[PDB]
Design a protein around this ligand. Sequence first.
Ligand SMILES: Cc1cc2nc3c(=O)[nH]c(=O)nc-3n(C[C@H](O)[C@H](O)[C@H](O)COP(=O)(O)O)c2cc1C
Ligand SMILES: Cc1cc2nc3c(=O)[nH]c(=O)nc-3n(C[C@H](O)[C@H](O)[C@H](O)COP(=O)(O)O)c2cc1C
Ligand SMILES: [Cl-]
Ligand SMILES: [Cl-]
Ligand SMILES: [Cl-]
Ligand SMILES: [Cl-]
Ligand SMILES: [Cl-]
Ligand SMILES: [Cl-]
Ligand SMILES: [Cl-]
Ligand SMILES: [Cl-]
Ligand code: NA
Lengths: 175, 176
Amino acid sequence: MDQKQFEKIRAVFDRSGVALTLVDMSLPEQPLVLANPPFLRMTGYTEGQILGFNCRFLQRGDENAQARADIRDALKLGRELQVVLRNYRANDEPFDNLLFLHPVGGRPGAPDYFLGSQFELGRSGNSEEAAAAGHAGALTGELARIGTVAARLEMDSRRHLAQAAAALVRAWERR
Amino acid sequence: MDQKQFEKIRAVFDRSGVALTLVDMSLPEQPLVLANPPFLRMTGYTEGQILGFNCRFLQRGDENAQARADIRDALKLGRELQVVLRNYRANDEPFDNLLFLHPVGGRPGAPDYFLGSQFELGRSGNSEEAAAAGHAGALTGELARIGTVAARLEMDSRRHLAQAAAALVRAWERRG
Ligand SMILES: Cc1cc2nc3c(=O)[nH]c(=O)nc-3n(C[C@H](O)[C@H](O)[C@H](O)COP(=O)(O)O)c2cc1C
Ligand SMILES: Cc1cc2nc3c(=O)[nH]c(=O)nc-3n(C[C@H](O)[C@H](O)[C@H](O)COP(=O)(O)O)c2cc1C
Ligand SMILES: [Cl-]
Ligand SMILES: [Cl-]
Ligand SMILES: [Cl-]
Ligand SMILES: [Cl-]
Ligand SMILES: [Cl-]
Ligand SMILES: [Cl-]
Ligand SMILES: [Cl-]
Ligand SMILES: [Cl-]
Ligand code: NA
């Protein structure tokens, strides 16, 4: 996909109010090539340390067995996916992470990039379900400005993505 | 408000995927001066037939008496407000409208414009709560692009607007 389209994704990332990451999928390691300020603000890292590496560095040891396996399928398959990950800030302090993965660019089942958006659980008090839904609606806004969600489908896509995020938080709150 | 700021609002309205309206607060009639495609697509009216009218044309009679009193106070005070109205499309189909009101520009207690954003209840099946919160999330995104929510405050704003939206839905479903 063009640098025209790539620079447009960059601009969306810069102004976005949700944490956004974009990994290159043509490489084996799937390195970070974009990471916006809301994401840096969450994680404690800065651009220097993270661009060019795989996003696993947010995990410690081995604690996300079932969830990394679901990622690895969704990624190889080119499907979107919402999953919760035990993650850690740069100061090692922990946080659960509702991660949204969206295929970007390329062709079906082989996207040029994957987009990832992280919602921090535990920060929203009594309304994690609403707050995750909120996150999913804001993310849908960004996906439309990028071109992945067609305008004619933006409303129903937003509805189904907020619903997925709320169901996920309901399970997580029952773990 | 600056001409440049108004043009920015117009550009946000025209590309947004949520319904957005802008009302001129400097006239007591409080007319619609902007109404974007999703709003037109949900109400069924054209742009030309509604600009310059007050948004109450979506209602009939003296319905929404209490909610309307809440709106009038929040408009006078320059306060944000979320509230459900009975409304009608141009073909007189009725729908319940979760309306989001946001003051725009001016000073506290005295905004230049009010922004309004309409979420249609009854259309998301069993996910009414998550759909409204999702709407609130997209809206906060638009309010940030306008400059009304500070860049760093967006995530907080969103969390709180989505929770407000969700409570209203839960109450609305309890009526029957
Ligand atoms: C776009 C994108 C964003 C990702 N964001 C995160 C993240 O925020 N936190 C995390 O723990 N893993 C994240 N991952 C997952 C890892 O990069 C990796 O793909 C996953 O853990 C499965 O890899 P592994 O089991 O082989 O290590 C992301 C993956 C992609 C493609
Ligand atoms: C920006 C804005 C948007 C509004 N959108 C709607 C709307 O979609 N539907 C509706 O019934 N009223 C809407 N209203 C409210 C009416 O215009 C009016 O303020 C309300 O009915 C209370 O005033 P009244 O009792 O004198 O009619 C909106 C008001 C503002 C300022
Ligand atoms: Cl998919
Ligand atoms: Cl389209
Ligand atoms: Cl519509
Ligand atoms: Cl007309
Ligand atoms: Cl007018
Ligand atoms: Cl009028
Ligand atoms: Cl009346
Ligand atoms: Cl007040
Ligand atoms: Na949270």
